[PDB]
Amino acid sequence: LDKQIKEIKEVIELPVKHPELFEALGIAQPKGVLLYGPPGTGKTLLARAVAHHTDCTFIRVSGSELVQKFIGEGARMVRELFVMAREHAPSIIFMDEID
């Protein structure tokens, strides 16, 4: 997955480490990434690796109610998780669609 590693690097590692590259390019820094492929192909593996190497906090959002108490006692909107993410910026919010 060297090509995938480079592709996810240019979008998640560069904006965190070097926002000046995107500012000089005059383009908005990427904020959303999609990884699509058959199950077991390493999407979660690459997401965790890119979160680990850039020192970005890795948050997995499975929508499970068991963890809701940690997200917030409100739990009325999923954006209530952002308060946690902002507290651990840079952050990578990861969600895997089981389908």
Next chain:
Amino acid sequence: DVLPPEADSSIMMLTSDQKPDVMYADIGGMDIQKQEVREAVELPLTHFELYKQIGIDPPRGVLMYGPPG
């Protein structure tokens, strides 16, 4: 004070008399399930050093699922 770890337990281990009378021979035709349970439960208990030497990580838990009965 510090109480002994085995003390203060509302749940008790199975005594000799509480052991069920069901044998492996009593169960018919679950060789695959028997092998998986043995390799994941009873074999790591007696052969943990072998698992370490080979490089296998023994499974901490086993979830047995299927239709009732």
Next chain:
Amino acid sequence: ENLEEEGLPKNPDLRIAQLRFLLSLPEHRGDAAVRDELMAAVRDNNMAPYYEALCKSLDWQIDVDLLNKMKKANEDELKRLDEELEDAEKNLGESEIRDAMMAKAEYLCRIGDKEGALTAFRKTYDKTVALGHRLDIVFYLLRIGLFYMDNDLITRNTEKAKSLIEEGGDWDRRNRLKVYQGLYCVAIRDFKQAAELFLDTVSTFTSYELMDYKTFVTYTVYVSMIALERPDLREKVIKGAEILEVLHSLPAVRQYLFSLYECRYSVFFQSLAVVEQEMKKDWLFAPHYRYYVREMRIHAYSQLLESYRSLTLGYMAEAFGVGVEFIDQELSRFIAAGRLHCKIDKVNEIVETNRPDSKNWQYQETIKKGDLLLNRVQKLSRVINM
């Protein structure tokens, strides 16, 4: 067929260390082939600091043109690596930064710049995120330590590699570390641990950057015949499938092993002389070639005296194919050292075996090692008081 490609990077090339040791020997200082191979390696790798060290220690004539060309190549490559690192730290990510430093450290190690290589490897390790990459850097440090026989470096990096392998369950790296540790134990006369590690990795050997598999098996046999009991030697080495398969291509080593095992003592002595001449030229076994061989001789003597109540001196001499006087001198020397449990009746020339209890042999070692530890404690307290 892809065997050597499996091994770790060949930096530093331990063949260079072996050839340097060969040139250090008085017998082989003038060997044109050894000098030619070492110079070819130096020229190919542009080892300017190693060329300086070679011409300083061995008192050679430094080729000014060759030295200048190699130094210019080193300077240009170092400038290129510095430019790559500078580009990485500003534009590329942390992984590319670590790759650039790894390239710089590999080049420094390749040209023999030991101290610079150690500094660069420490810097690369400090911001290396992958555990396996860190362990590869530790193996690089271990190879550098083995290249210069740096005991402190080897011990520190062995402990670090053990910790890293414990953290991440890398059994391949565990086998490689076992091979490296066995090589070091060979270097420091720890033949028991070297034999144990070599036998553990006789069927998983992939460290072709250290030695060829045939050389590894020869070393394994050599340490096993000195560190293993007869049942262990039979079970692990004599009946070992991999060892026998390799020995099919090494008639001399198989003869040396089986002559001892099959009690062909004259054949064993001839093979021991051949093995001694082999150890003298090996940079790993050179400090111990006098020791090892002597021990082997004792083993042979002990074996011939283990099953018999008494043996005539003539019978021993005939069995070993030597003179009676030689057997007398050797047995007297080894009994005086306390290594053979027998006494010689020179009047009738009969060696009568003894069976001293293991309690005496444990008590003597207890006295010796307790005295060593007591001296350490005393000198430590002496340091503490002032």
Next chain:
Amino acid sequence: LRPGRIDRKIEFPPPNEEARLDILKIHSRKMNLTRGINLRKIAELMPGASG
């Protein structure tokens, strides 16, 4: 799928023979392996496999 929402879409196709060999090398490194395992042959023996 509207442009501008997902700034990059990355495909993770099932590994080919060489990628399967690389994954095999990575995962068999955690095991006590006999020397001379032909991991290339095993990779060829797993067509259309995932990591």
Next chain:
Amino acid sequence: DDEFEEFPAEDWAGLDEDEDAHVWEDNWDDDNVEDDFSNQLRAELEKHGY
């Protein structure tokens, strides 16, 4: 410290090229002066006419 300059410090003149630099259980028997076992065995093989 009161270093012992009273005693005549005989010159080192030693080899700073890592003469031994080893850590073993070294014993005196390795220092016994003698030719190699190969030479001894070779010199005694022909002592019997072989």
